[PDB]
């Protein structure tokens, strides 16, 4: 008997039991006798969800058997199997309803039977806020009472609401599990049909919290699959009826886990014989995550402790610096290589250096795995690691990559601080902040001189290569989505920053990679994806989608924009820009000036005067506020001739970008020393003087076509 | 000349607070506030009065003289305000719940709120404390005790929106105020989070922040202007929600309104400055796009109600 035939057989047995008990209700109470569940507004929830009909009398209960019959179509296709599972759920509900009709109180304590609506509203808020990570539906019998008690109390200690069906109720009592609604251990009943009482909890969750009307069965099934984190642990031998009821749980999107050999279906029906791993298997199968409130370190942990100073004579261990080699690395590895919450200290511990304050090598290798964790998010995780270590009292971390060094104070060590606590801080809050991209985190602290050098050359150094190559070699043509930031709209309402790999933010603190990770960590945050679809003009940077997404974010203030030009519909500026480039018509080029420069530009206006018109989120042709890195970009005024339009820069500014500016101008084929041709403040400050300087220098900007 | 034909494609949604014949409607306008000459102003802005669950110790002496024999018992206080001033709604601020002062368990405060809601006909707005952590527990118990009256839970910030929204709109069928900090993007963000959680625009109102005149007031004015223009001019579906701004919370705590004649003899009367401070603050936010204000002094309510009536009729 295959899976489909087992489910069909179980559904038929459920129908047979429903017909028999309905016949008893008709013979003893008549078709006019009332049918109801104690304290609910949804009548029989499963039938109300599936059909929208409320059943009030026994005669209608007998007419509900046709719903079960119409749900059993014996054709071996997945949809029929799910419908047959729902047939078992409807039949089980009819059996439970007839129980209340036949006997006034059909459940005796500890069994609670039906769960009233006020209880659902009572536990609904923890279900939405995640205070209840999931619902563990445990039915059947474990090999022994202690096995059941261990699994049940493991779920209870994790905050999950566990419901019990069958002999596990007695096994848990023998195992001394404290059962209650406040204790989140609810025994429903000894019969298999009592599992419908937790099914109606999920059904009414859709009815009450999802606001889905009765009869919208597909919407209700979609709701329970996405919103209700329920799963089934079926222990002991499974009859056909149990399997068909499990098909009902699968129909609601609840995966079924069992210790029995079954025809496994990936993500839906799974066999796990190891009772020591059943809880972890179920949490993974239902995507349930349990949060850790407390960092398990004796030393106090707070954001206030960063920025402290350890006395020069009250240090204990000084790892790294020019003294010894220390490094850090965050890796994106496969789930196989990362084991959750593994802290490894390789080499002598902090308790070994009892002598005067000394130095030891330090290697902090962090392995991170996740469903949607990629290599572009590694720098973001590694940047935050600096503040994670500084938040600990007596521990201060400064530096990145192999340029890091961490000093430990005496205060922490006397309170039992060890190198293992270093991995506890990272792991506990790596899962906290990066809770949507990090599934498992594995931290190894290396302090052996031999291994610290070896692991750097195979993990650290090669991965720093990829970071530098990715940042340098990424251009606008390769990427397919841009990003838009609107965090400066608090004072420039009409300002939208379009971030491309060759054009970062005006403030200079947001780049294409940073905005990519901001969107992933904070989907509703300031950075949103901008598709690069619809190309009106390639040279000027005009895109159909960019204009659409700029008029939406700016609330219609700016409708048409260009990315590679300063004359035709330029980008807006907020006021965080450090450098502003202004057009100089008499020189057939543009002038630049940085914020710190307090003198007068050849344009006749200082930085403050120019910032009063460029900023504020207004489109001013001819003037553009940008970052300090955008100067040496290949897209710096691509549509206005290119990089060679620069004719005047401050002396301090010219030196900073001289190496990068010269390299970029080399692609323009002119002599490498382009900065030598650029005039500076020292040479001249007036328009007529700088033009003469450009005439004698053979500056390329003069020979180009007229900019204006 | 040419009469300005300003056509807005958006329309603010309606939120109903309370039950019975005294229930009030917010929003519904498709034009700027008081622009009866441009089109349809949906619902007239409402004016509410503030009470406390404890005796008002920091209120001005003229206010203490009004609420002499009724301030001790919130149930008596709520009935006194309803029968004497007939406010559109009554705001019950749970001062006893804040951890910064006479911190009390959420069960105690919800019991006080239960008696008040069952002793008045007017819709009730239960204002929480400033603490985000306490408001999550406070509103869970309050919304449970006061079930079936459609109260308005206030100050549900991004931190506790999951807890307040679930225990509010979804569970016990109440209304929730989604509060942001004087920003359109932050206001737009919190509304999106409520919508994703399963709460559409008809079940929550917006609080874009409030301030007293002269104390960061232009920031509130700009935010109100921006959200109104985006909701109507740009047909932004995530901002088409009514706005409630508590004026008495901020306008009545300033030096210019609390100082008595002993402290500042030149400033004149204290009651006049307290009323004049709330009237100026409320009138300015009403003109900027606020659909409901909360006032403390009874005289401020009469002036604002006359102010609303004159402009609309
Ligand atoms: S300048 Fe920087 S912070 Fe401001 S909006 Fe642009 S990307 Fe965001
Ligand atoms: Ni900016
Ligand atoms: Ni700026």
From TrEMBL, chain A:
Instruction: Name the SUPFAM superfamilies on file.
Output: Prismane protein-like (SSF56821)
Report if keyword Nucleotide-binding is assigned.
Answer: no
Give start and end of each Carbon monoxide dehydrogenase subunit alpha ,N-terminal domain.
Answer: 20-101
Query: Which positions does UniProt annotate for Ca(2+) 2 binding?
Result: 182, 490
GO function term, MF aspect, one: CO-methylating acetyl-CoA synthase activity
Q: Work out whether the entry's keyword set contains Transferase.
A: yes
Q: Pfam families under this entry?
A: ACS_CODH_B_C, CdhC, CODH_A_N
E.C. code: 2.3.1.169
Which positions fall inside the CO dehydrogenase/acetyl-CoA synthase complex beta subunit C-terminal domain? Answer: 464-708
| Residues that hold Ca(2+) 3 according to the record | 705
One GO biological process term:
acetyl-CoA metabolic process
Q: What general EC class does the enzyme of this chain belong to?
A: transferase
Q: Which residues bind [4Fe-4S] cluster?
A: 485, 488, 497, 507
Enumerate the residues binding acetyl-CoA. 311-312, 399, 405, 407
Residue numbers binding Ca(2+) 1: 174
Cite the entry's keywords alphabetically: 4Fe-4S, Calcium, Iron, Iron-sulfur, Metal-binding, Nickel, Transferase
* Cross-referenced NCBIfam families: cdhC, CODH_ACS_al_bet, PRK04456.1, PRK09529.1
Per its record, how is this protein called by name?
A: CO-methylating acetyl-CoA synthase
- Tell me the gene name: acsB
TrEMBL record, chain B:
Name of a matching Pfam family: CdhD
- Residues in CO dehydrogenase/acetyl-CoA synthase delta subunit TIM barrel domain copies: 14-256
Superkingdom as given in the UniProt entry: Bacteria
Q: Which NCBIfam families match?
A: PRK04452.1-2, WLP_AcsD
Entry protein name:
Acetyl-CoA decarbonylase/synthase complex subunit delta
Give the lineage. Answer: Bacteria, Bacillati, Bacillota, Clostridia, Eubacteriales
